[PDB]
């Protein structure tokens, strides 16, 4: 944003108040102010606003998004000295290395665990297969066995990958974009098992993060699946909780993705030197990380000295046990297509819009082949919005709802009270050869843009011509 000031974005689930405390120490010593914000959907927001030169100076996200940011050139190469590099674990530096260059500072290693209420379930299940019978028993006490976020595929991935699902195949040191493991026997069985839990009313398809959290933290469900950041709210709730290895599926460990929370510096920030100093000399210290960790736990931190200090925490131990059974996320630019593909597949199979076999058949192609469409359409969208904003100027107009790219298609700026129609985008043709007949709308209201009507898959994904 502005010279002589640091703006930082970080997810609203993380220790942002803790990070702001490090910010306050920074400005006390340097005179240079630090504002920490937690925009919704910042990982997508970032490439849009950072592409126009207006991001934060620093963005925090798991490392999987950073190769895409790097490729788009939205990230400054970082310059830590040999002394500093030695203070963090090699494995965490690898997570932020892209085409041979370091593109962010690693902060902490995250993996999902099984979090369970010890009073409801003193001996938690070792197997996913045991869960339906546990739920039946608990429901007779007005309690349920398990609730977790079903809207974000990050949370369902451990079960999909358990019996052999994978994202991109890694062989001979590189990811093969064409070899996507979301549609093999293991992945199918995993997603089928999830869909059966919903069918049998052990879970509801619409369950999201805040719903699952609220249910666990009020003592209503015996288990959830969540990361280290969630432990602080559970502490506040006084639930007697344990954090443990995820259940097995078909005898195999669940295989969560491992993320390294990382901090990248905007390539357009004028304050790259200030950004460096904050990250290297304030945040990545025992004291900086303690401040953040005490707000919302980070997991296993990248800084060796502090990771050693924390290592006996049994909840971190469980985290590390689940991470060892899991796999590091790729950081390749195509991970954005992978996550689109699998989120679509899980939401569709869970809601009955597609069968599991069709959902996954399509996701395998979409993970491999959709990124180029996304990139083309995103770039065309930014151009259309620029043109539209210019014409609003020429017409003495102002946008009721701003022009935006929503990862699927382009919405021109609109007046309050105006509906906008767009053609179904080419993206949906894999589902529907007649997607070119489809139309999707949004309404520009006093409360901003409405959600798409119909929902995108309903509008665009079912072949409407037999
Ligand atoms: O569900 C897809 C989503 O998964 C990961 O995001 C995680 C993030 O890594 C965690 O730190 C925590 O914030 O929860 C997120 C899931 O809601 C990937 O990092 C992300 O790029 C992907 O879209």
Give structural notes.
There is one protein chain. The protein has helices spanning 16-30, 42-51, 66-71, 82-85, 90-95, 131-139, 153-162, 185-199, 209-217, 231-237, 272-283, 286-295, 304-310, 314-325, 335-351, 356-369, 371-394, 456-460; strands at residues 5-9, 33-37, 58-62, 97-98, 101-102, 105-110, 113-117, 144-146, 166-171, 174-181, 221-226, 241-244, 257-265, 300-301, 327-328, 404-405, 410-411, 419-423, 439-445, 448-449. It is of the alpha+beta class. It folds into 3 domains: 1-110 and 259-330, Periplasmic binding protein-like II (D-Maltodextrin-Binding Protein, domain 2), CATH 3.40.190.10; 111-258 and 331-369, Periplasmic binding protein-like II (D-Maltodextrin-Binding Protein, domain 2), CATH 3.40.190.10; 370-466, no CATH class. Strands 1, 2, 3, 6, 13, 14 and 15 form a 7-stranded mixed sheet that branches. The protein has a 4-stranded mixed sheet with strand order 8-11-7-12. A 3-stranded antiparallel sheet has the order 18-19-20. Strand 19 and strand 20 (448-449) form a beta hairpin. Helix 1 runs antiparallel to helix 12, helix 7 crosses helix 8 and helix 15 (335-351) packs antiparallel against helix 16. A molecule of 2 linked components (GLC-GLC) binds next to helix 7. A molecule of 2 linked components (GLC-GLC) is lined by residues 11, 13, 43, 62, 64-65, 110, 152-154, 227, 259, 339.
